[PDB]
Design a protein around this nucleic acid. Structure first.
Ligand SMILES: [Zn+2]
Ligand SMILES: [Zn+2]
Lengths: 51, 51
DNA sequence: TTCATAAAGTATACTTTATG
DNA sequence: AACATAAAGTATACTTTATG
């Protein structure tokens, strides 16, 4: 959970790991400070409001 | 601290300990859910925007 | 023109709800 | 329906700013 990952939605590198979603080590959830949106790495994404 | 303390501002008992201000154990800072204002128990209080 | 303390702000890590 | 996962929410714990 150290490596910095690009945002799949906006492609920025200004991202940060936040927490493991659903108590699962296979669901590392990140945040993209640029698009103000979370994503779960390796999981599916849905269209959420930017902000 | 877990003892519930009355809010010196509005007198309510719906208050909660939150944290030690300034990393000082002598500044236990509480929050009054009623008036929506923080206070440091035993410290000086100032007129702050309620809310 | 510096510092302890009061207030305000923000990151963390959990919990609650939404989605398909 | 219902269940795992995506998203959203929130107590907690820290950091930064304001005040006198
Ligand atoms: Zn992004
Ligand atoms: Zn009060």
């Amino acid at each position: 959970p150290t490596k910095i990952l690009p945002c799949p939605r906006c492609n920025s590198m200004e991202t940060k790991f936040c927490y493991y979603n659903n108590y699962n080590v296979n669901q590392p959830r990140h945040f993209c400070k640029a698009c103000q949106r979370y994503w779960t790495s390796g999981g599916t994404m849905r269209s959420v409001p930017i902000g």
